[PDB]
Structure formats: structure tokens, C-alpha cells
Amino acid sequence: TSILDIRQGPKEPFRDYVDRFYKTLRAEQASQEVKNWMTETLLVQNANPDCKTILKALGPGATLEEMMTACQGV
């Protein structure tokens, strides 16, 4: 399965999705800079509308514990 095919379900906790992401990211062998680009970009983009909304409110500069606690009720 390709990294672009990794997406969050409509009922799937973000948490279970983030695990899937760094597992597939774990099978990507690209430069770190590209993998940083993938992190800030693709993760949020394939996140579900309800959490996506939430993550837009965190702004930039956000870290994984704060994202992970931010989308917990969703």
C-alpha cells in the first residue's frame, strides 16, 4: 500500500490513523526533508473533516502530543 492511500476513516480515531501513518512512513526510505514535508502535509490532508477542523485551530508549530490530545473526543 502507498503512503497517499493512507487516510482517516469517518469513525476512526486519529490515534489509530497516526499509527498507520508512521508505520507506512517507516517503509518509506526518502530524504528526511521530504519525510518532514510528508509529515506536515499529508497527515492533516487525509485526516477526517471533524478532526481536520480541530487541527486547523491548533495552527502551525504544533507537536504530536498536542495533536493527539487535540483530536481525542472526535
Binding site: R15, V18, D19, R20, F21, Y22, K23, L25, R26, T63, L64, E65, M68, T69
Partner: protein, 147 residues
């Protein structure tokens, strides 16, 4: 790990498969539970950075946590470099170089280099510095993964 031989010197010996597997099995069974930290600590007795990356890299599953830890290890390493600046002028022929955050993380150093630092007199405890970062990052995880 670096262990003491019968002759009375410190030499490197490899870690055992049923030790490896015991590390695996702990993680399988008790995931993020606190007992993992003393357990880790015992199984990390006399361990190298290189052996510590081996243990972290051999994890399967819990990849969100594994990434959070990585990023904690690099933060703690960035902090090592900040707090301890590089030293004045060129490196002496008679001496060996001071470590950076990445040598502590095992990344920029070789095994023989890791054995130089630990076995030499005075010895420097680069295992114990990485160990605190691991334990600190383990607290971060434990606190998050509490429900």
C-alpha cells in the same frame, strides 16, 4: 554491551537472542505500562548506544509513540549540543574527541569509538545520558498513554 572479562579488562560482547526476545516480549505484553521502565533499565545494564538503537529499531507496532520518542531523543540530543559547546581549537593527537548529541545517540559514532569513551580513564557515561533521555521520553509516553 561492554562487560568485564575474566582477565580483568572491559571488552565488548554481543547481547543474547533470549535477551533480545525478552525485550520483544515485554513490549508485546505490557505495551506502555510503567513496569516497562525498571525492566528496560535492568536489560540495559552495560549497554551501548548502538545496542539501545538496536532495541528501539527492532520495535513493531506503536509507531506514534516510536515517532514521539525519536523526536524526544533528537530534542534531548539538540539540548546536549546546546549546553555543551565544542571545545577550543584542534583535537590533540594524544587525545580522543569530545562527543556530540548524535555520538550519544550513537548515530555519528562507531562502536570502537563508543568503547574508547566508556573504557578510557576518566570514562564518560554516554549510555547513562541516553538512558535518561529514554526514561524521560518514557515518562512523556506513559503520561500521554494514560487514559
Amino acid at each position: 554491551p561492554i562487560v568485564q572479562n575474566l582477565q580483568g579488562q572491559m571488552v565488548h560482547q554481543a547481547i543474547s537472542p533470549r535477551t533480545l526476545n525478552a525485550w520483544v516480549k515485554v513490549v508485546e505484553e505490557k505495551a506502555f505500562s510503567p513496569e516497562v521502565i525498571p525492566m528496560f533499565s535492568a536489560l540495559s545494564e552495560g549497554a551501548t548506544p548502538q545496542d539501545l538503537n538496536t532495541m528501539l529499531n527492532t520495535v513493531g507496532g506503536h509507531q506514534a509513540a516510536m515517532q514521539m520518542l525519536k523526536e524526544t531523543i533528537n530534542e534531548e540530543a539538540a539540548e546536549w549540543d546546546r549546553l555543551h559547546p565544542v571545545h577550543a581549537g584542534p583535537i590533540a593527537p594524544g587525545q580522543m574527541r569530545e562527543p556530540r548529541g548524535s555520538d550519544i545517540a550513537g548515530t555519528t559514532s562507531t562502536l570502537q569509538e563508543q568503547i574508547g569513551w566508556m573504557t578510557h580513564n576518566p570514562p564518560i557515561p554516554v549510555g547513562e545520558i541516553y538512558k535518561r533521555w529514554i526514561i524521560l521520553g518514557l515518562n512523556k509516553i506513559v503520561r500521554m498513554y494514560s487514559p
